[PDB]
């Protein structure tokens, strides 16, 4: 088969800067007259989406800031000015011959301005505690960049395990991340303590920030 090699694997651009991503076919996929390379955008959680067909034809409804060029083996997708909602993986695909094959993807990442997390804490619902378990959720909302350190403190003691974290992809509207950290305890353990605290360290903050509740 024909191998499409995309580059780079990851592209980071600032808000409103130009983004260029390349796709090299292992052999020619153009005639005298037309090119058989197509470009797609896969936004997080969604199917791929057609942007550009036949190397340079902008698909209908696709914003004007997208464009494509090249012939033969070397093809490029240009975004003239990157917006938050352009956060996606971009895939090339040929239809020169059987079987159509896809490139490996270029992840486009957006270097937006530094933002500290707003931090919130949720005690366990009464509903959950009826069942014998207590999840305490600590939320770090709308921060940039990604690196953030979260630590749980129960009665001022550093908790060593029993928590799990998950971070979002970059947000489609403001390019920030959010993170949830959930501390899971049995109802008994939960109730044998008073203070539940989450301590957040992030480079947009000059000190650690602590949200807590007493039960």
């Amino acid at each position: 088969d024909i191998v499409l090699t995309q580059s780079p694997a990851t592209l980071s651009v600032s808000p409103g800067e130009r983004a260029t991503i390349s796709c090299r076919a292992s052999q020619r996929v153009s005639s005298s007259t037309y090119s058989y390379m197509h470009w797609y955008q896969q936004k997080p959680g969604q199917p791929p989406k057609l942007l550009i067909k036949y190397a340079s034809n902008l698909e209908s409804g696709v914003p004007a800031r997208f464009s494509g060029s090249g012939s033969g083996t070397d093809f490029t997708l240009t975004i003239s000015s990157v917006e938050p909602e352009d956060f996606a993986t971009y895939y090339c695909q040929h239809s020169w011959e059987x079987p159509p094959t896809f490139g490996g993807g270029t992840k486009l990442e957006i270097k937006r301005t530094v933002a500290a997390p707003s931090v919130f804490i949720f005690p366990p619902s009464d509903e959950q505690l009826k069942s014998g378990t207590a999840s305490v959720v600590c939320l770090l909302n709308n921060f940039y960049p990604r690196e953030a350190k979260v630590q749980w403190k129960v009665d001022n003691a550093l908790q060593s395990g029993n928590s799990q974290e998950s971070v979002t992809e970059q947000d489609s509207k403001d390019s920030t991340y959010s993170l949830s950290s959930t501390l899971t305890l049995s109802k008994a353990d939960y109730e044998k303590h008073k203070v539940y605290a989450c301590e957040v360290t992030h480079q947009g903050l000059s000190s650690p920030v602590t949200k807590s509740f007493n039960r």
Binding site: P47, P48, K49, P99, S125
Partner: protein, 221 residues
């Protein structure tokens, strides 16, 4: 509007079969080729094959010609893909997609996650994360103890999307998944607005709505 709507996520036992469907609407079904495409988790795209729904001509990526059977029901505007004797490597999102002339693929299904596993499906419990920072409040739903992926969440049947963050699942020690979906809103309007999270776990046929109300107590016994 053109639309391709795929069947729900499913767990399949190793060595079993599964039949995926793709319902087409807003155009004449037999006027476009239909492709099936495989996306392995955290991975890129592979073509499974092509069916011509007018004349049934198929064309398979050689790699899948022993794995996949493509059919259609023209009377019902629906393409099917049957995947045979599944193993771990078949765990993936499967997309149907259309193509007017076998070049670009201009409309896509939303995808079906097939997870190959011996573990039983399990539906999640949904718990409120009841509602401050710079005059904003956070609220959410904790969606706990489900297998396999995926769970989807919307807020207020899709009317509430601004500020929503629905986290990637985490894998718990039990081997069951967990996720939270949260939103930030004005703290000022917590007593006037209604926030309901809609949780869908297609594999267990779980479709659950949970009103998240403000945490509203002087007495401690």
């Amino acid at each position: 509007q053109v639309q391709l709507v795929q069947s729900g996520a499913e767990v399949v036992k190793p060595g079993a079969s599964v039949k995926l469907s793709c319902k087409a609407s807003g155009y004449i079904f037999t006027s476009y080729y239909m492709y099936w495409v495989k996306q392995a988790p955290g991975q890129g795209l592979e073509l499974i094959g092509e069916i011509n729904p007018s004349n049934g001509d198929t064309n398979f990526n050689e790699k899948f010609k022993s794995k996949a059977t493509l059919t259609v029901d023209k009377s019902a505007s629906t393409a099917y893909m049957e995947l045979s004797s599944l193993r771990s490597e078949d765990t993936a999102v499967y997309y149907c997609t259309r193509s007017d002339g076998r070049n670009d693929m201009d409309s896509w299904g939303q995808g079906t996650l097939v997870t190959v596993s011996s573990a039983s499906t399990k539906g999640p419990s949904v718990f409120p994360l009841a509602p401050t920072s710079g005059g904003t409040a956070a609220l959410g739903c904790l969606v706990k103890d489900y297998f396999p992926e995926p769970v989807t969440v919307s807020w207020n049947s899709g009317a509430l999307t601004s500020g929503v963050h629905t986290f990637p699942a985490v894998l718990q020690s039990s081997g069951l998944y967990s996720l939270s979906s949260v939103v930030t809103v004005p703290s000022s309007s917590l007593g006037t607005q209604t926030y309901i999270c809609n949780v869908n776990h297609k594999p267990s046929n779980t479709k659950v709505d949970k009103k998240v109300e403000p945490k509203s107590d002087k007495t401690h016994t």
